[PDB]
Amino acid sequence: NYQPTPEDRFTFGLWTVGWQGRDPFGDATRRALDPVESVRRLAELGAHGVTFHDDDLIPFGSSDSEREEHVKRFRQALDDTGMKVPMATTNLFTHPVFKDGGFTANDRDVRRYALRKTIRNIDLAVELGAETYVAWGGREGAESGGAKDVRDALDRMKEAFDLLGEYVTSQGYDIRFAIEPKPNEPRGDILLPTVGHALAFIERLERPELYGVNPEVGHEQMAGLNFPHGIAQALWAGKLFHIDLNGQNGIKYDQDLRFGAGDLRAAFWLVDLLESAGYSGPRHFDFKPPRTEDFDGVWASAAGCMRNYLILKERAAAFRADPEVQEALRASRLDELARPTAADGLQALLDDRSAFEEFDVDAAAARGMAFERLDQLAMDHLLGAR
Amino acid sequence: NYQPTPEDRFTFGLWTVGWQGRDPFGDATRRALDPVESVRRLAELGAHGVTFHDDDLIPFGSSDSEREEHVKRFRQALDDTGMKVPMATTNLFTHPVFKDGGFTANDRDVRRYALRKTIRNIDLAVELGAETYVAWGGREGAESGGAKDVRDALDRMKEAFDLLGEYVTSQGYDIRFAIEPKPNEPRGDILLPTVGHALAFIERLERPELYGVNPEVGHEQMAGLNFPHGIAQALWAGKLFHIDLNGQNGIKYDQDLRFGAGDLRAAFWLVDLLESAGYSGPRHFDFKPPRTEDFDGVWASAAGCMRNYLILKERAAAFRADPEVQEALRASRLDELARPTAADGLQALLDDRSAFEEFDVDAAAARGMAFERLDQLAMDHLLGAR
Amino acid sequence: NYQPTPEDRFTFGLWTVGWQGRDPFGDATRRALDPVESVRRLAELGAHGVTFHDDDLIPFGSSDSEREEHVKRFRQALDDTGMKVPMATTNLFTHPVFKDGGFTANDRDVRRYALRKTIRNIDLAVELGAETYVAWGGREGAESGGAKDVRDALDRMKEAFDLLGEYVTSQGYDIRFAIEPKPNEPRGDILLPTVGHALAFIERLERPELYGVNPEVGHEQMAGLNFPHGIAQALWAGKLFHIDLNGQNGIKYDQDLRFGAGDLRAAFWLVDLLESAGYSGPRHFDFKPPRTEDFDGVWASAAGCMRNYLILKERAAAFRADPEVQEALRASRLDELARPTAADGLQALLDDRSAFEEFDVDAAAARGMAFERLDQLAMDHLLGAR
Amino acid sequence: NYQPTPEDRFTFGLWTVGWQGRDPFGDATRRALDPVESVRRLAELGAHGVTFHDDDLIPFGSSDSEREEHVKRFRQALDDTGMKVPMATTNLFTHPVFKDGGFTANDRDVRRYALRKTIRNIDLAVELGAETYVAWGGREGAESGGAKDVRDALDRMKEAFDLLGEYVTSQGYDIRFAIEPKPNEPRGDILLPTVGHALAFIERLERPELYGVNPEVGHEQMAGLNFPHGIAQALWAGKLFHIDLNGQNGIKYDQDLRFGAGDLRAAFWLVDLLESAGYSGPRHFDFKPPRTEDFDGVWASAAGCMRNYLILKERAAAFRADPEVQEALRASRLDELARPTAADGLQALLDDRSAFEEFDVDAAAARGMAFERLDQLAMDHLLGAR
Ligand SMILES: [Cl-]
Ligand SMILES: [Cl-]
Ligand SMILES: [Cl-]
Ligand SMILES: [Cl-]
Ligand SMILES: [Mn+2]
Ligand SMILES: [Mn+2]
Ligand SMILES: [Mn+2]
Ligand SMILES: [Mn+2]
Ligand SMILES: [Mn+2]
Ligand SMILES: [Mn+2]
Ligand SMILES: [Mn+2]
Ligand SMILES: [Mn+2]
């Protein structure tokens, strides 16, 4: 059991299972994959769809006729399998020209080229039916303080995203943008390093309604942050347009382990939250089968992503549906948390002696929150030890 | 030299130099300080002002006549010294009643009390002439996933800050709020953990213009983030209402070292940025003289805060004024970074073959950024080795 | 099920369930516990024993007759319950006198007093039948570079532990020492910050056979290290004299969550390793029920420690006993890892053309390690989803 | 001024200035350097010598006649410049064959090949006159718990280093080994992750006198550890055979910034310690000019390494020579720290009522350590603000 169906809306980047295993200290351990083969293998595993960087689908420098042929072949594999392309993105990090950034490169000519490169792939994403266009500004940032005036850079980042929003509007496209934060790597510090920074930035754009976030499990964890908390704030803001699922073991390089690996309990609380909130977007895995693996290991790792989600979905749902858990939630006053503090209004609060003059703070203080009992119920449910 | 004047607008919390040295593993190493004595000693050192939590100035549980006497004495020390009170805040973390939070406590009665406690001290802050009212929600958060629905909690946080904004408006007060992020400690994860999260949250409040951030050097660093970058985004947003200066050595407990200790180069880039941006608010130190110290060490540590700022101010200004640095900034294209990418507009960008069709990416790529030469000029300036 | 028995050798410090909830930002949330009550409650939960700091059992400053009475009462609770005292330790961190350390305090008189304090409690530990005497040098370290010459300090640390070893030898005691590393907190950096540093240090003592390590889950994790790896090296060295079990969520302050909380998968691999290696010492919990909790929460949290160990023990054993797992381990060549590289000796290795001249590196490289399939089997076993 | 001379014994790896700028997200930004050119440029900058991996000097797969020619040319550049080769090492991480390790690869045939590869380059290192042979087991470790039995792996690591020690002994070579710890990257966790673990491991080898450590600034910092403390323990053990100098900004990927960048104050305390201890080995930089740079930036960055050391050497020496600093060190009792705790012996300590019975702990406690005043003197000296 825990067999995925395309109805689970599990998606994978071409660059995930297609990662050849090059890391900063070693050569490739696997040959390149034909995107057509990935589409087929992923479909067989129960995937709903795939995603791509322009340069994953179409090799850098391709001529227009090479371009069409790559696209034609990919389109046939999609038609052959029933697979979808719900999201696409631009590679503004691999080519040396982007060594100081794309949209916030100090060189003006590079920023212009980065926008043109982007715009080109948005048209293709729309043609393949993508609803979301991701941006991961991996090269936007610095290793040293003087190299990047961040206020100027944010000015340039806003300029770029506003122009993209003008473009999609002018073309009548329904696609929306999702900004993917990362705190560092490959730059020493990257701009908009967390969900928070991305969310705040978007509120300064000309048409904020066109932009949301694409948070990645591992990236927030690289800042030691609580990824379920960040997702909750994103949901609260109405800005969870897409998500990247994977695993990460602490504050270190971006590991991109399969989903469920890494911080297992955070994975549980994440699935709990996504299902509870009714998140309806793709369940996208941005991961890398470890370079220790051969192609059988690649597909095993991809299957594991999906499996682990489905297992965690079952355990979270059983947790929430358990009457003993519902009673614990009441004992911990989660029901009170959801009630307004002062629907009676400011003046009635000021006039309420039960809120200050006659508040027994010592009796309130004495009330245990019973959070450990609640958390052991969650643990027992996660491990199937009820 | 590097003698501070009250015109430098250096301020200190009563709780900084007054910290008795209790930590989670040890008892107090210093006696409590009378706020009157701190005002006097700080004034002698060249401080401009002091700040306070309600419970620092007035002991918890004080009767109204004890309250007035505490206030009267403090007011006399201010009058005696010419010291100001530019900021104040509420203690919503020490009393056991706040063990699950103030504004986002699961218990509704506690949330109400937290608002009343806050409102009371805002009136006093206004009387003492404070322009900024800080909120550090140190207890807002969780140790376990089930204990806190973060969407409900953010609903309650918004409710609380909106009511405070309604209150100050109804009283015609000119004071503004500054939210102070911290990613963890004392809660396992704290809500609005970074400048980003705080900035984004504020855009959801009813009158966002009333709220900014009070970022703390050490807190952002506890998330491994670049504090000068975060300050830049805060400035970019127009939301740097206040700042907390101190030192931190990496991702660990909140150390609250004196300013300049910790990450020395980040301190330099921070001062560079504050002075360059014309930040005009207090230069506030939220720090703790290490508990190894006696009272002479306390005042030495406080003096060091101010000294280090002034030294770093001198070095940053010399860096920026150096013609050789100005030429390096041009060689690294910082001048281009400040120019709009495409003031010519979207269509002209789309029509510009120099931006794509005829862009020589390999020539662009070949251009070194010369950032290391620039950074060694900054290093030489910092260390006075030019 | 997953009911502990005293035969599981689960032990708890008096200071764990007795922690009143004081943290650096808040007052106590629970009253002090009588050690007699803790012994009784723990026994009821299935604990095997308790541990203590001198100052937990006997209040600082107690007179000899107060001392005897405290001891007499404790001894009656042990007799009443069948509970044991397998380990004890000294408090060289709470009293202000230890603000710069115990054994490595800059003040010579303090170092002498720290040794006398220690020696006194070793005699009591022996009387109560302890086999292990722990040392956690929480105050040994620095916040600044000039304050502590580390070579001099290590000289003093060696001097102290050698004198303790001379003492126990001179008294014919069979007790052994276990050094407990912590990388920071409460000092900015603490000496012997990891298992590694402790292990290396011990090899410089006069009678190294008398000293091992007492690693703590959360402490190594505070350095972002892999606690199962560290335990393995400790076991490899023959130096795992004791262990502290708890949970920690990343690189931050010492959280001391209940065992199984924090990094759940690391807890699984840890239990796997302890059981597989035949670790026969106490399963000791150094934890803190969160200060959100009342006394019912304290005992629930303590029960959870034990429960989670037993659940993880069952899953690890089923993993290792699973024939499909045994085949995967062979496919991943774990059997080869356990074979000597070159039992044939150096010259035969040099003479073996299969090892270099005629080694097909490309064929070797092409062999996938099949580690992901193995790890998903471990995941399925952990979550009971086989 | 701050002009290096070859007498400063500054050395650089061929792979540092020769790094082409490939990172996990981007292609090379600089062409490959001929080792002959690096030798020449480095010599011009004031370098004393260079170091190499076998595969840096001789391309993988080179035939014996290609080998000789590469070596001949390199030897001519050394002769031409007066440059030395004090250290060499083996590349056991780049080739896919090493994807699960060299000495601790699960595959036995790979471990054998890794030893042969190593032995071959030791003979060449000796011929070029190297005194130290470094080992960085970057691939030794795991991403998942079941993939690597660490006790078996350490057995294999010991086997490998013992065989290497047998080899150099059998050849009468005077070269010594230096193990270079790294906590993670490229493996999820790496074996012997810190100086501590390496030091402890060495004490289990057959001829421990042949092995020391080669600690790297950035690597220890990747574990949030205090690199000057670790170096002190290495020196204390007599095991600082070599060192790698660079910069790192916190717990993240291995940045390999130029020395002095990163944690500037740690760089100061490090230089203070090396000079104070009389470290006489190479001052080796294992760094990477950021990929933003062209070749002029590469040489600027390399020059900066040397400059920053010399500036920090001058400031540390002035700190220590300052009579006001010497008085502060006495006020902080650093002189007492260096005195034995109890040269009078155990019995006299037990008999000394001044050490316990009549020790005034409250008076001792009341004595401030004056560490902040001392640290601001160090700060003033570092910044040239005395
Ligand atoms: Cl913003
Ligand atoms: Cl928000
Ligand atoms: Cl050692
Ligand atoms: Cl060892
Ligand atoms: Mn990632
Ligand atoms: Mn991603
Ligand atoms: Mn702080
Ligand atoms: Mn603060
Ligand atoms: Mn702990
Ligand atoms: Mn412990
Ligand atoms: Mn490195
Ligand atoms: Mn190195």
Side-chain angles (χ1 to χ4, degrees), chain A residues 38 51 103 115 129 142 144 153-154 170 201 217 285 299-300 303 319-320 353 357 367 380-381:
Chain A
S38 293
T51 63
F103 302 161
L115 285 159
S144 53
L154 291 172
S170 79
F201 174 75
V217 170
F285 301 101
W299 305 119
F319 172 71
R320 292 298 174 174
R353 295 173 60 82
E357 297 87 346
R367 316 196 238 276
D380 287 349
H381 269 284

Side-chain angles (χ1 to χ4, degrees), chain D residues 295-326 328-366:
Chain D
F295 283 136
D296 288 329
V298 160
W299 305 119
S301 195
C305 286
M306 284 191 290
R307 189 174 176 77
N308 283 336
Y309 191 101
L310 292 175
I311 297 163
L312 295 176
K313 179 180 165 168
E314 173 195 75
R315 307 309 168 78
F319 172 71
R320 292 298 174 174
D322 185 346
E324 187 169 337
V325 168
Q326 293 169 2
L329 287 162
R330 285 189 307 259
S332 294
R333 276 85 84 205
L334 274 305
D335 59 315
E336 288 202 26
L337 177 69
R339 311 209 276 265
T341 291
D344 48 346
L346 173 62
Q347 189 62 53
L349 177 57
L350 294 172
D351 286 346
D352 183 3
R353 295 173 60 82
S354 85
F356 191 81
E357 297 87 346
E358 301 178 12
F359 185 51
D360 190 343
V361 306
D362 283 343

Side-chain angles (χ1 to χ4, degrees), chain B residues 254-269:
Chain B
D254 188 33
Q255 295 192 275
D256 278 1
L257 305 178
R258 90 188 179 276
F259 186 63
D263 187 338
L264 180 50
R265 280 203 100 192
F268 171 83
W269 293 114

Side-chain angles (χ1 to χ4, degrees), chain B residues 335-361:
Chain B
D335 59 315
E336 288 202 26
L337 177 69
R339 311 209 276 265
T341 291
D344 48 346
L346 173 62
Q347 189 62 53
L349 177 57
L350 294 172
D351 286 346
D352 183 3
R353 295 173 60 82
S354 85
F356 191 81
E357 297 87 346
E358 301 178 12
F359 185 51
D360 190 343
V361 306

Side-chain angles (χ1 to χ4, degrees), chain D residues 226-326 328-362:
Chain D
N226 175 316
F227 185 72
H229 285 14
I231 296 302
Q233 186 168 345
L235 287 164
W236 191 68
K239 291 296 189 193
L240 192 59
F241 288 6
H242 199 267
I243 199 161
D244 279 1
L245 305 171
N246 67 11
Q248 180 71 15
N249 275 309
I251 301 158
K252 31 167 119 356
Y253 71 101
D254 188 33
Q255 295 192 275
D256 278 1
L257 305 178
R258 90 188 179 276
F259 186 63
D263 187 338
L264 180 50
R265 280 203 100 192
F268 171 83
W269 293 114
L270 176 65
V271 177
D272 173 67
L273 172 63
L274 295 177
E275 301 298 326
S276 289
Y279 171 65
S280 72
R283 275 76 182 161
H284 186 242
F285 301 101
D286 184 5
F287 89 116
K288 290 175 169 60
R291 77 189 272 288
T292 53
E293 307 301 288
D294 61 18
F295 283 136
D296 288 329
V298 160
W299 305 119
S301 195
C305 286
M306 284 191 290
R307 189 174 176 77
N308 283 336
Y309 191 101
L310 292 175
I311 297 163
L312 295 176
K313 179 180 165 168
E314 173 195 75
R315 307 309 168 78
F319 172 71
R320 292 298 174 174
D322 185 346
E324 187 169 337
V325 168
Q326 293 169 2
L329 287 162
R330 285 189 307 259
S332 294
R333 276 85 84 205
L334 274 305
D335 59 315
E336 288 202 26
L337 177 69
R339 311 209 276 265
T341 291
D344 48 346
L346 173 62
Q347 189 62 53
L349 177 57
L350 294 172
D351 286 346
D352 183 3
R353 295 173 60 82
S354 85
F356 191 81
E357 297 87 346
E358 301 178 12
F359 185 51
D360 190 343
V361 306
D362 283 343

